[PDB]
Amino acid sequence: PKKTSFGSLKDEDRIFTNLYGRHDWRLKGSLSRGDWYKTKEILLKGPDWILGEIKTSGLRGRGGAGFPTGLKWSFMNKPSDGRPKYLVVNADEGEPGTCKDREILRHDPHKLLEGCLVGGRAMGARAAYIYIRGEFYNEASNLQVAIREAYEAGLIGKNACGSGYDFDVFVVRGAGAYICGEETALIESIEGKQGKPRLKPPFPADVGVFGCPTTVANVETVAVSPTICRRGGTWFAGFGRERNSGTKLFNISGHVNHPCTVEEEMSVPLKELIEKHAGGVTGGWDNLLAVIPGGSSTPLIPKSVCETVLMDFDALVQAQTGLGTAAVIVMDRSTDIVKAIARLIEFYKHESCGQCTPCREGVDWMNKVMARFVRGDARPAEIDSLWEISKQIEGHTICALGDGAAWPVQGLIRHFRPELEERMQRFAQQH
Amino acid sequence: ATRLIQRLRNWASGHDLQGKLQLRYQEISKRTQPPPKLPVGPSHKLSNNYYCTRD
Ligand SMILES: Cc1cc2nc3c(=O)[nH]c(=O)nc-3n(C[C@H](O)[C@H](O)[C@H](O)COP(=O)(O)O)c2cc1C
Ligand code: SF4
Numbered sequence: 001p002k003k004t005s006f007g008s009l010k011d012e013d014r015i016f017t018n019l020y021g022r023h024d025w026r027l028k029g030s031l032s033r034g035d036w037y038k039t040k041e042i043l044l045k046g047p048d049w050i051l052g053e054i055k056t057s058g059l060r061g062r063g064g065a066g067f068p069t070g071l072k073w074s075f076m077n078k079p080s081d082g083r084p085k086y087l088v089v090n091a092d093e094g095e096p097g098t099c100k101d102r103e104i105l106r107h108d109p110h111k112l113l114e115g116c117l118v119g120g121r122a123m124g125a126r127a128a129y130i131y132i133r134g135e136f137y138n139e140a141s142n143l144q145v146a147i148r149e150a151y152e153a154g155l156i157g158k159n160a161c162g163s164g165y166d167f168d169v170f171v172v173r174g175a176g177a178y179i180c181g182e183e184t185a186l187i188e189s190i191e192g193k194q195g196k197p198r199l200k201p202p203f204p205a206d207v208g209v210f211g212c213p214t215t216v217a218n219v220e221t222v223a224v225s226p227t228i229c230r231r232g233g234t235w236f237a238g239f240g241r242e243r244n245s246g247t248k249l250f251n252i253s254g255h256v257n258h259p260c261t262v263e264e265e266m267s268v269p270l271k272e273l274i275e276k277h278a279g280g281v282t283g284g285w286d287n288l289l290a291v292i293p294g295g296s297s298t299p300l301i302p303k304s305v306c307e308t309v310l311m312d313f314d315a316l317v318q319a320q321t322g323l324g325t326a327a328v329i330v331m332d333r334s335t336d337i338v339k340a341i342a343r344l345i346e347f348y349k350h351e352s353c354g355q356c357t358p359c360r361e362g363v364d365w366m367n368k369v370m371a372r373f374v375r376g377d378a379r380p381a382e383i384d385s386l387w388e389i390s391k392q393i394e395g396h397t398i399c400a401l402g403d404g405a406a407w408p409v410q411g412l413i414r415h416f417r418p419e420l421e422e423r424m425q426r427f428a429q430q431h
Numbered sequence: 432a433t434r435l436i437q438r439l440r441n442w443a444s445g446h447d448l449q450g451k452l453q454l455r456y457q458e459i460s461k462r463t464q465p466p467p468k469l470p471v472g473p474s475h476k477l478s479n480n481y482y483c484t485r486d
Contacts, residue, residue, distance in 0.1 A: 385477040 001239070006268040006310065007276060009247070013239070015227045016263055021107040027149040030110035036155065039114055042229050043163035047077055047122045050229045054122075057233030058245025062220035063090060063183070064295060064325035066313050069221045075205040076123040076215050083212040084126035087119060088190070090218050091131050092174075092181035096296035096347065097327030100249040100261050101219050105139055109146040111223050117160060117167055118226040123215050127168050131186050134175035144171055178351040182399055183216040196355040197399045218325075220249070240266030244312030248326045252278040254291075255332035267312040270301075274330070281330055289333045294324020296344055297404030299411035300337075320411075324404070337416060338423065341408050342370040348405040359402035362393040370409065373420065376427035383413055383420055 055070035160167035185195040208214025258279035313323035354360030
């Protein structure tokens with residue numbers, strides 16, 4: 001906690017039971033969990049103290065942005081302006097390294113629904129819009145069923161479980177739009193407009209879907225929120241480092257004996273969960289040289305800095321790493337890395353639409369440059385030029401897809417430069 | 432080009448002329464020469480080339 005000791009976490013500290021599907025994801029199972037607890041009484045017809053409960057919660061963005069969600073949601077204490085206000089929930093779950101939002105929807109829709117109700121009330125929202133993947137059809141039906149169970153019970157619909165605050169959710173789906181993983185792209189998806197994100201002289205808070213003001217939040221934040229509004233949010237604020245208050249899902253993945261998702265205290269050492277929840281990588285931890293924090297977006301972490309870093313994102317920032325929804329992809333040393341990062345940047349090129357020029361062209365270009373690198377044909381100096389490209393991508397691109405498009409190879413330069421040159425020399429020797 | 436005539440010529444000359452051939456004979460230089468390749472140019476480095484400095 002306050003001490004260097006970490007890896008500790010009580011099961012009842014978890015907001016999320018039935019994380020793994022046991023004990024009935026059905027609404028009856030939510031009742032066994034007593035999830036509706038004081039949910040009607042939370043609706044005292046005035047945000048503030050719940051909104052302040054979240055401000056005091058220490059809670060920040062679970063979209064990987066890490067942005068203080070209490071302040072983010074503070075924005076819609078504003079008068080409705082006569083245009084109906086909505087809350088849009090981000091359920092894209094297209095991001096790599098991220099299976100976290102999948103099993104929760106598969107096994108615990110209800111806490112999220114209560115989150116739509118509480119947070120939707122906090123916004124004064126007319127409704128509760130929720131995106132779904134087109135890859136996510138069957139799951140959309142599961143959630144539609146649980147939501148129907150919420151209707152029949154009257155827990156939603158008109159007045160919604162008493163209190164008299166009208167509340168209708170609206171399930172929404174897309175098709176192949178990974179960029180709608182970006183929030184404003186999804187807000188654009190709602191109008192039937194293509195999911196190419198807006199520039200923001202006005203923020204989404206100022207203007208939302210259909211011109212009527214809206215708001216957005218990641219599934220994790222909005223799902224934890226009702227429990228923040230019930231169980232003390234200060235109790236949530238107690239875990240981890242102060243700025244890193246609360247808990248985060250840890251999706252250990254890739255080459256390891258037991259890859260898994262484990263919600264956990266924000267600031268456990270990164271090696272610990274590998275040695276614990278992950279069961280350790282095959283061939284032992286010693287093989288590790290490259291394991292990436294974040295959803296295949298943030299820069300790579302070498303084992304030396306890896307031993308020191310705590311899972312909370314600030315420790316990552318000192319490791320020069322973003323939050324990235326704290327997804328974790330382990331990468332064993334025996335495999336080549338450059339092919340992997342090239343495959344990743346390829347993943348960006350397939351998915352970046354291409355509205356503003358610098359990122360479209362920047363990725364379309366940097367990809368081919370990576371092909372030249374991986375083939376080994378490339379001259380050693382060329383890689384440095386790629387760095388220049390990165391510099392022209394970052395603060396210029398209208399959206400952060402380009403940022404994560406740029407970073408991993410920046411890390412591959414910064415650490416694996418000698419490795420790169422070593423690879424090039426072998427191609428040099430063929431003649 | 433006869434040698435006695437060379438002697439009498441250089442005689443009147445006050446100078447050897449054979450020592451500095453006046454009419455350009457065999458030596459000249461070859462017309463057909465192997466390709467120049469040319470200097471690469473100082474600023475064709477790719478790592479940096481911002482106009483802000485070279486300007
Ligand atoms: C499932 C999911 C996918 C996302 N994908 C992207 C993305 O590809 N690019 C991006 O810039 N932001 C992405 N975001 C973050 C959004 O830009 C937006 O700021 C975020 O969803 C809101 O975070 P919050 O709810 O924690 O405030 C994603 C967020 C979520 C929840
Ligand atoms: S920047 Fe490139 S990626 Fe981000 S939105 Fe504009 S086009 Fe799509």
